Design a protein around this ligand. Structure first.
Ligand SMILES: CC(=O)N[C@@H]1[C@@H]([C@H](O)[C@H](O)CO)O[C@@](O[C@H]2[C@@H](O)[C@@H](CO)O[C@@H](O[C@@H]([C@H](O)[C@@H](O)C=O)[C@H](O)CO)[C@@H]2O)(C(=O)O)C[C@@H]1O
Ligand SMILES: CC(=O)N[C@@H]1[C@@H]([C@H](O)[C@H](O)CO)O[C@@](O[C@H]2[C@@H](O)[C@@H](CO)O[C@@H](O[C@@H]([C@H](O)[C@@H](O)C=O)[C@H](O)CO)[C@@H]2O)(C(=O)O)C[C@@H]1O
Lengths: 519, 519
């Protein structure tokens, strides 16, 4: 009569058959014990009309050497299995009960005789496909009955669960995986999400990789079928596997609504990683190429690729590429893409690349900091760019300031202190006071909020230009393991959108009210 | 400059679209160089009528960091990709030319401008599906033309190539992988091949694993659809992922033609490895179960499973299971399966389990040797069993003798000396003088012929009861990387069959003339 319940803070996907609502460990069972019924209660203000079904599963027992504090023996719903990312793997979970009309109180039953020791059950919630992304479930296991005696319930299960949508699942359109998210909002309020389409596997360039794009005109409820924003197929009669293009960055020219996508095209390089194999020079045969496409129809169709390598790459650099995620338009109309280069001695540096002429020509000046890679840039005050950098030293984000488009750089007070990381891509955006419901300038940041691994994907807000990130002004979205990359874009005045690699899908979209972030 | 050719000693699969005949490295190319023409010559006695097509592919260049001695940048034809194991991955190889009528001289052409430095081409052979498994190609690249000047050819390319058949490819019947081959010949000359059907991935028990069986009544030219010899589905309401059965061993009762299959059923154990997680006791909830099925109709249908655990397992053992591969009938009608057990202190021991009553009851006496696992047994002389053991000490096979069914054991002269291994399953069989064309007692052995990795799958023959394995009495079948497990069975008086995990398919069958092994 002692049962442990977890309510995991992971997204409930509106497009999934199964989502883990509760994991349950019964640690000290006698052979033949039966979980006769368990009762679930939903908060009074929950929209139960959007809940399609609730299922109780049994997942058997634990291995003798894996200890007694786990809530599962295995991943119940895979985000990697190309054959099934949408329902529980039936080989790990057997359905005991199912309810297809959901009330505020709900009872699930089993007749399953338990084995001696640890026994695992879990509750799946299925949502209607048209469920609001802003909907929230407050669910609690209130009663567990074993051998017709109510059992003592323990565990943190008070989580307020949020909805999301799997824009790209492993295997979609025959692609093994999707990685490296970028997100912008066009002047028409259209969401544009870019990513690597990694056809063969999940390894970085060099490989068969194109830049894909997902488009939504209804704030992420619906996503139009995947467009290929950029591709090099069998250029020069070299295999598509030696013509990959990826690590995309996307920005909206706020003056013209012209959408720009920059990416790294690797030509040759056998089947090895560009990071260690891209070499000095300028030609496609010599070094990775900086390539760009544009859309003048709000991201519906895409220009042929233009090669901008000659404009910005020093010949001595082993590798120049965009910082993955997004770029910005400044108040004065300057277009800015974060960049990174590996110098002649294999030392990586983060910096910025900008256009003054609507993207006709691009310029790079001085690197911001030694041994940095992926970076995102925000205009924190007029003419003042904040670069927020992945740092190979580990532990925390590097933060620098330029007032001269990266001719010179100043360390910010928050440098290597305020924002923990595990050496991973992070998103930073600025929101003007007049452009959001709070009526105050915001910085919004997202990354895996840990110094080890990639998990606890969190949106953080700053009211003081990134000097301070109060714990209260943070929302945890995904406490389980993923590939960690994310990108933020304001959807409207009241909600921020996050397009990220999650524990529940390769490309996950969630929408969060600013009023949830700030007070 | 020179051009390098390799003729890799790997099986040409009769059921494949593409097979690597030649790999070609042009190391010192000038940008724009064109391989105009390449001429292939076949031996005068080759059966070119069963060659369906020959293709020339281009696979681009090499990575800067991967040196200049490789014959490819990547696996051309995958044995793991569930979406395609039968043709070249089109993202790594572009077809230049194709010939569908093959003569003793053959010319392939390209117009492809080469990149500066290393350029890779390769020759694919496609065989008629009804190609004899005993057929051999003797092929050499005799001319390579670059910029209408013949180039200097170098490299070992004098291999005599052999045919094979992919009985099981990764992805077949929705299964991620197939592992752990066993092979017997029934009294009706029927080949029976058993293996793990590993549905979710390629990891060992505990997982969703069944024992599959492939049957051939024409010496391996054709294989009947996969039968499930053994399965535990959702026994006791535990998931199929916690009801795996695998590491199968198969023997023919030569007196009755009754076919027996023994396998390890793991019940519970979360999603962890049975090797470290099976614990002392006797019940399915406590420890791995030794389970058996039989076929009285030459392997067409299979009995329900019988639980043998209580007859032979010491309660203090963490784990008792069959040695994967095959068992034997002795001259006196005793049925013998090799076995292995992990004692109370986690020390593994190889031994034998036998029946004197046509498989009604089974008995285990003493272990042969400390820190041994997988073993195969042959009757080398009347009443004299040779156990050939995987040894955790590394470098070489353990070999012991019993003449009292393992009550007592003697080290053989060949022990830890004569047969190199990398710690891997190996096959051993005996052939009586009156049962084969040579008219002499044979021992035949197969394993990866190396002390490191799993490659150079080789059949070895001994004329002196395993005292000596002369280098001349050996056939190399697969010089490239695989999972290494194999099982031998005589097909008829003239040919040995090998069912093995190869570089070209999860379950590969080849047939070899004894007269190729011996002089
Ligand atoms: C163009 C490019 O390289 N792509 C990006 C890559 C970058 O290299 C880093 O931003 C800069 O350091 O980062 C990502 O992938 C990383 C990560 O997986 C990391 C840790 O797992 O390993 C890395 O590669 C290692 C490893 O050992 C190698 O075995 C893997 O290939 C090598 O030794 C050199 O770094 C691996 O490249 C990532 O963070 O997710 C994917 C991103 O597209
Ligand atoms: C359970 C069982 O009966 N399975 C068989 C297994 C046996 O465990 C060994 O004979 C015992 O020594 O052998 C095979 O699997 C091996 C192999 O994959 C090997 C690496 O090539 O790793 C091994 O696992 C390691 C690693 O640590 C573990 O963490 C990985 O799983 C562990 O220490 C056991 O040695 C892994 O068991 C093999 O040789 O191919 C396949 C065969 O089914």
């Amino acid at each position: 009569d002692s049962v442990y319940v977890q309510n995991p803070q992971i997204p409930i996907l509106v497009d999934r058959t199964d989502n883990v609502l509760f994991r349950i460990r019964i640690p000290d069972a006698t052979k033949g014990d039966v979980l006769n019924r368990l009762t679930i209660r939903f908060g009074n203000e929950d929209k139960l009309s959007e809940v399609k079904a609730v299922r109780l599963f049994y997942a058997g027992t634990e291995a003798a050497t894996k200890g007694r504090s786990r809530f599962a023996p295995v991943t119940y719903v895979s985000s990697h299995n190309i054959r099934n990312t949408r329902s529980a793997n039936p080989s790990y979970s057997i359905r005991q009960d199912e309810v297809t009309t959901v009330a505020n109180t709900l009872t699930l039953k089993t007749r399953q005789p338990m084995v001696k020791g640890i026994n695992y059950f879990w509750v799946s919630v299925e949502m209607d496909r048209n469920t609001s992304l802003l909907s929230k479930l407050t669910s609690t296991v209130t009663e567990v009955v074993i051998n017709d005696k109510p059992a003592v319930i323990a565990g943190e299960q008070a989580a307020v669960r949020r909805m999301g949508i799997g824009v790209r699942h492993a295997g979609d359109d025959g692609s093994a995986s999707f990685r490296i998210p970028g997100l912008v909002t066009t002047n028409k309020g259209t969401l544009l999400g870019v990513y690597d389409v990694r056809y063969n596997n999940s390894v970085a360039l060099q490989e068969h990789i194109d830049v894909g794009l997902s488009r939504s005109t209804d704030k992420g409820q619906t996503w139009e079928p995947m467009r290929i924003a950029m591709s090099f197929g069998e250029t020069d009669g070299l295999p598509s596997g030696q013509n990959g293009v990826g690590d995309p960055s996307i920005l909206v020219d706020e003056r013209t609504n012209t959408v720009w996508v920059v990416a790294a095209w690797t030509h040759g390089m056998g089947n090895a990683r560009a990071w260690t194999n891209s070499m000095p020079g300028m030609t496609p045969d010599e070094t990775a190429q900086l390539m760009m496409v544009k859309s003048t129809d709000d991201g519906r169709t895409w220009s042929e690729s233009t090669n901008i390598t000659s404009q910005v790459k020093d010949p001595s650099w082993c590798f120049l590429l965009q910082g993955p995620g997004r770029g910005i338009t400044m108040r004065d109309g300057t277009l800015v893409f974060p960049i990174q280069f590996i110098d002649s001695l294999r030392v990586p540096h983060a910096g910025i690349m900008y256009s003054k002429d609507r993207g006709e020509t691009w310029h790079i000046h001085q690197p911001a900091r030694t041994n940095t890679t992926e970076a995102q840039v925000a205009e924190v005050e007029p003419g003042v760019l904040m670069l927020n950098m992945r740092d190979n030293r580990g532990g925390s984000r590097a933060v620098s300031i330029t007032r001269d488009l990266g001719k010179s750089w100043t360390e910010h007070s928050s440098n290597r202190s305020a924002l923990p990381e595990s050496i991973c891509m992070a998103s930073l955006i600025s929101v003007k006071a007049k452009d959001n419901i709070i009526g105050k300038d915001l910085l919004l940041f997202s990354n895996p909020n840990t110094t080890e691994g990639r998990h606890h994907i969190t949106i953080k807000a700053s009211l003081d230009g990134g000097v301070t990130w109060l714990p209260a002004h943070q929302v945890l979205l995904d406490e389980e393991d993923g590939w960690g990359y994310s990108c933020l874009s304001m959807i409207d005045r009241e909600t921020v959108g996050i397009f990220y690699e999650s524990s529940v899908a390769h490309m996950t979209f969630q929408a969060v009210k600013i009023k949830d972030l700030i007070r």
